């Protein structure tokens, strides 16, 4: 199964520039950090759960925080991208748990945020005072605000008295019954409708 029947030699890409490109990327990152100092080099990202049944076990970083997350955290949507927070207006919060986790994440960031005044001689009440402006900082939000628990714990200890009884009939039989009911949902509905029509006709 070799696909060499076209003029493949015109489109061969070698990668001798791999260490040079790593050096170029590191120089660009150092320049970006020096331009952004004392801000972190990256923006804060929310925690989202991967789609599909293969990957819904694991969480990861998403694009940006939702508008309802920002509203529940008390950060206006025009202020948020100016203080290192990514905003995503497309994502919605369908469930309470992800919303609560990302709201707590935003609150921890806001509690650890040091906001310098726009004019040094005229600080405002929303600004961090000068005698709190000096503290140890982080320059990597992907590290200091990473995904701490991407997966659930695979091991947990409980007492023998707290062992669950289990579903009646067994887990295998419960799976078989659930599959059977899903396959027979429409047949039973049609049969019930026909029985109701017959009962109405010959009541």
């Amino acid at each position: 199964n070799n696909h060499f029947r076209k003029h493949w030699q015109r489109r061969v890409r070698c990668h001798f520039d791999q260490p040079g490109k790593k050096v170029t990327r590191r120089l660009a990152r150092r320049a970006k950090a020096a331009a952004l100092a004392p801000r972190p080099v990256d923006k804060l990202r929310p925690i989202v759960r991967c789609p599909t049944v293969k990957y819904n076990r694991r969480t990861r970083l998403g694009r940006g925080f939702t508008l309802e997350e920002l509203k529940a955290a008390g950060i206006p949507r025009l202020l948020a991208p100016t203080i290192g927070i990514a905003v995503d207006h497309r994502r919605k919060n369908l469930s309470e748990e992800s919303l609560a986790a990302n709201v707590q994440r935003l609150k921890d960031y806001k509690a650890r945020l040091i906001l310098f005044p726009r004019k040094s001689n005229k600080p405002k009440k929303a600004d961090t005072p000068k005698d709190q402006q000096t503290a140890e900082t982080t320059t990597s939000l992907r590290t200091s605000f990473g995904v701490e628990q991407p997966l659930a714990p695979g091991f947990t200890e409980i007492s023998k008295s707290e062992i669950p009884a289990g579903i009646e009939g067994g887990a295998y039989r419960a799976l078989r019954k659930a599959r059977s009911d899903a396959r027979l949902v429409g047949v039973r509905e049609k049969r019930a409708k026909e029985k109701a029509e017959a009962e109405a006709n010959k009541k």
Binding site: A152, G154, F155, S159, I163, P164, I167, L175
Partner: protein, 108 residues
């Protein structure tokens, strides 16, 4: 290397259905047999459980966190109660867990 080749020595002498738009993530269900079930427990606490230093507590094993969706039933289990949380399970695997004294819980 060119000096080891035989050419140097030869110098001087010459069905079924079609499935459109198949998404493999639909059919993701890796399986693990019950004879590997205790290897998911970390080694130290596993050794205490197998020796008999934990007579009043039972391990709860989440297969999805380890990357498995179905518990299959090859092998035999020791007589230690284990709670197993799985998306799928075979009838023999559930039977052997129940004889061991645990329970198979269903999760999504």
């Amino acid at each position: 290397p060119t000096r080891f080749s035989k050419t140097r020595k030869h110098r001087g002498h010459v069905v079924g259905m079609r499935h459109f738009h198949l998404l493999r993530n639909h059919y993701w269900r890796p399986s693990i047999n019950i004879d590997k079930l205790w290897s998911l427990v970390p080694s130290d606490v596993r050794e205490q459980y197998l020796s008999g230093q934990k007579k009043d507590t039972a391990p709860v094993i989440d297969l999805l966190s380890h990357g498995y969706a179905k518990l299959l039933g090859k092998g035999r289990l020791p007589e230690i109660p284990v709670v197993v949380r799985a998306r799928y399970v075979s009838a023999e695997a559930e039977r052997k867990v129940k004889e061991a004294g645990g329970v198979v819980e269903l999760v999504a």
